[PDB]
Amino acid sequence: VFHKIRNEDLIFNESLGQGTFTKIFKGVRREVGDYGQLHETEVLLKVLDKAHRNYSESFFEAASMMSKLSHKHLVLNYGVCVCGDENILVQEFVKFGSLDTYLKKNKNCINILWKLEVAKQLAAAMHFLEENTLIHGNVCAKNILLIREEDRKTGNPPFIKLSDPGISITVLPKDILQERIPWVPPECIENPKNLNLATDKWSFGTTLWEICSGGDKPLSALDSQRKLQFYEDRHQLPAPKAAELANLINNCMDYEPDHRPSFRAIIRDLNSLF
Ligand SMILES: CCN(CC)C(=O)c1ccc(Nc2nc(OCC3CCCCC3)c3[nH]cnc3n2)cc1
């Protein structure tokens, strides 16, 4: 399972935000690194809400999935803190934060080549998970972290990482799942038992829409019931202004789960634009 980190070696600093039933903090970890050298390491601290301790099993399982695998595009888990009654995950601190905020604030300063490079990296991470038959379950721009910005001294591309999915949608309350439309696929709204590898293909299409839409949230103007009726009438998301990926978005967001393309095919589609 996880590595145990003493709270004496952990300092909680600024709050970065809130997840689903969690609070997110920037922290510092005091550790012995390679060659016995003492290090002061920036860490991300995810604390499960005390009013939602019942989700602790799903809270830690979501991080345990990512730790059992090793890949350059997956966020590293350092371990779990020992505070007695608290549930605290200690993860690597990515310096440029989540993709969805980065897309908003750098709206004008992002062309199609930047978005394609990030899309290819996300597709590579999802292909890696698909080859391991591992279901993420919460693919969204919020859960994409920017390790490195694009460098214009070289043209060096940005580098992204995919974080853990958090508390699974199989146990989340109904109202939370419907707030997550259109990231949650239609078959999961009908029955969260339908969580499948095909789920991540749908959510990837929604995340691709986010990347092309400069940080806009799809269907944000619709309330929950209107989000449900969006699936009932089986509508598709509007084509983004930068519409080079609109066909891939709709292909991924197929209402028939069996027809959504494999990430091998998605990558091939992505690579057809250079
Ligand atoms: C000045 C403005 N910036 C951007 C430059 C920052 O403050 C900032 C924020 C976050 C990181 N880093 C980060 N963020 C995560 O989650 C993303 C956050 C989760 C909950 C709230 C929303 C974002 C992470 N998960 C696992 N390792 C993570 N590392 C770096 C910088």
Side-chain angles (χ1 to χ4, degrees), residues 16-17 24 44 75 91-98 145:
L16 300 173
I24 314 301
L44 186 108
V75 175
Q91 308 186 326
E92 90 184 273
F93 184 81
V94 181
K95 55 155 45 185
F96 289 119
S98 66
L145 313 174

Side-chain angles (χ1 to χ4, degrees), residues 152-164:
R152 289 167 177 167
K153 300 177 79 128
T154 319
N156 217 69
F159 192 91
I160 54 97
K161 278 198 177 186
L162 177 68
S163 65
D164 73 284

